[PDB]
Amino acid sequence: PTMYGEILSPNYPQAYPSEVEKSWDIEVPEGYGIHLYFTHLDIELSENCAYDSVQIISGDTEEGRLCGQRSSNNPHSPIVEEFQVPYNKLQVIFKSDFSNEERFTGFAAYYVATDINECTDPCSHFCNNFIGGYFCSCPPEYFLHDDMKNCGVN
Amino acid sequence: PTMYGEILSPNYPQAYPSEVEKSWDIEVPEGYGIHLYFTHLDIELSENCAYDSVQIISGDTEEGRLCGQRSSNNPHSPIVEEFQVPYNKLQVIFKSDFSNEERFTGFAAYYVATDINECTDPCSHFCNNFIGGYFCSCPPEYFLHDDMKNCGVN
Amino acid sequence: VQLVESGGGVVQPGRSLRLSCAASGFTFSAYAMNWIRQPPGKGLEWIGLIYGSGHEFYASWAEERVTISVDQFSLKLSSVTAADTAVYYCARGRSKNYNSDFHLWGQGTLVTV
Amino acid sequence: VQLVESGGGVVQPGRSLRLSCAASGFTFSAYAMNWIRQPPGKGLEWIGLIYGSGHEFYASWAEERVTISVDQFSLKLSSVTAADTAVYYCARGRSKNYNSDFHLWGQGTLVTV
Amino acid sequence: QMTQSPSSLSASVGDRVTITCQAHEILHDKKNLAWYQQKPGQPPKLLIYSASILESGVPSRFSGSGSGTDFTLTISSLQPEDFATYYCHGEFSHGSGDLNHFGQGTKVEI
Amino acid sequence: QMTQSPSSLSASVGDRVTITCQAHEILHDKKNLAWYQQKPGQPPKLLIYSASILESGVPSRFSGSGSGTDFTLTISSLQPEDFATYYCHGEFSHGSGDLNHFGQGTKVEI
Ligand SMILES: [Ca+2]
Ligand SMILES: [Ca+2]
Ligand SMILES: [Ca+2]
Ligand SMILES: [Ca+2]
């Protein structure tokens, strides 16, 4: 597990090679989600991103598929695209086909581990969230049971 | 250093003993602040909390001093009082004087480690916050120097 | 700490009323924040509050046609009758999840209908 | 996804203009959000945007007179002149930090002065 | 929800004034009653809170007395700066009607 | 910022329509130009974005093209449902005027 990281296309920041298939596995600790944001996108554009693409894949699901050349028009933020998953595992797959004649320079993305708010998103009386988990608390009369979930009088 | 914890009055949830001086030291890891919130407050009331009190002190500076009987009128939140410090160390001192005749039941408080947003509160181009720290990034063709703070053209 | 209100004036009946208040010295998210009003010659009348965690609570006479929002601290009153002519005040409670008193008041914007 | 606007009516000159828009099926914090207006018989005129991160940008003719807020998506226009009567639209951009097009429009509230 | 008596009171300078407030329900924390003084053209000024605690800067002639539902504001010696209108304010626990309520008021004149 | 030509155009059903837009600056990402179609009493409908990409559901007769400053919308076969007003919309990089700007419009009639 890891709290943060970076994913760059092959040969970044220069042009990526052709006929290339690369994969990255993102893992953060339990109790954490993943926020993955792209700060650079320069990829050959095609319909449905069927030639060159970046696939963001969750468990047996496709979170996203990116191609083309985009950048932020916000002066206060360099983020082009972003994904926020409530899981501790993610996959990034970069695919490049036969020809890169136009010399596209690929992508640059970063991910960080976010905290799951288990109380907003589990306790009989009071849920207190903390970074990486939660605990349950009770009014001054009740006591916590052995399951650490339910409270009752003595 | 912990990510969360609880502080209860002596003999809680019953009446606290008289002539009592107790201290607690809260420590969280570096890169974190402290959010300490009281969910129960039942202490002998006095002018300037001169007889029975709870003192919250960070680095020999008194963050707070509480006494009296209070509870929240918010149905959703049970928090009576709360303190949010950007340091990773805190101290809580409970003082009880000669006679607790009215049988006050003391206090119950909880603390959690909060994340410091080093970018909002350190980089030449881009600051990326993560839980427990930050890193610096820069646009393409800008490489980070050895200080991990400044980027330049190769 | 200080509170200043704005939005007072003359409003035709039936039309909505919007009032705003700005603080200087504290954040609105740490204290319970209140709207109160006073008709000319009449006593103080509590309109509503939003707690520090953020929770709008209203008086019985104002539950349906009042919305109080935070950002600033603004109050929005629906279809306005001649009974809505009043000096409107903003007030701050002692803590986050209770009031117990109003020590910091605004200055009061007179609204005529 | 859907956007619905409200607040359209008759407003006396010099008075205040406030319009609101509610989303349906998406959050306002993930897309750049835009106010546009169209005078009767005239073309489309971009008023302003707020990006997903929360930064508000305005057209040159409205940088001093317009405030655009997100909560909801509200537009606030002062010193309303007989040139401010128009059908006001809310629109959504393709991404968070750029528009590139408006694919999801509202319905348009007619405002008369 | 809470009734304040009397509606008005006339007294000379140097006498004692008693203003009573009766709440129908028990107050939040049993003592969340505040006393305010208001002058024409001015916002109200907090004199007393928690039914007995003077706020900083308030002269010592003002005093508060508290019970479960019956509270009293006492002025032990009237002064030229004590002629104004006075308000009790109660905070009530959730489910007991409104959260906050003001009394009718009591105008004091010489 | 945006100059759309012509102001109006009259053609029969089955002919080709050309509408030009000139930006006088470089668009954001060099290609952020959208084409919309509006009918009376209705909001505008996005036809084309990124200066060439047809939106889902748009007939294939509509086509887009253009370089950094000059852009073109082409209707290869007019239809009874193609008579409306057409707008180009440009996004511009921060620091070069407004972020977004619409063209004047072009009404098409039989
Ligand atoms: Ca390729
Ligand atoms: Ca958690
Ligand atoms: Ca004691
Ligand atoms: Ca950090």
Side-chain angles (χ1 to χ4, degrees), chain C residues 1 6 9 22 33 36 39 44 83 86 90-91 97 110-111 113:
Chain C
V1 284
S6 68
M33 274 315 308
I36 296 129
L44 298 159
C90 175
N97 294 325
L110 171 59
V111 160
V113 194

Side-chain angles (χ1 to χ4, degrees), chain F residues 5-26:
Chain F
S5 178
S7 212
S8 50
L9 192 158
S10 284
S12 307
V13 179
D15 324 302
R16 142 178 268 93
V17 194
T18 289
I19 305 170
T20 327
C21 204
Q22 222 204 8
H24 301 163
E25 300 97 82
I26 297 294

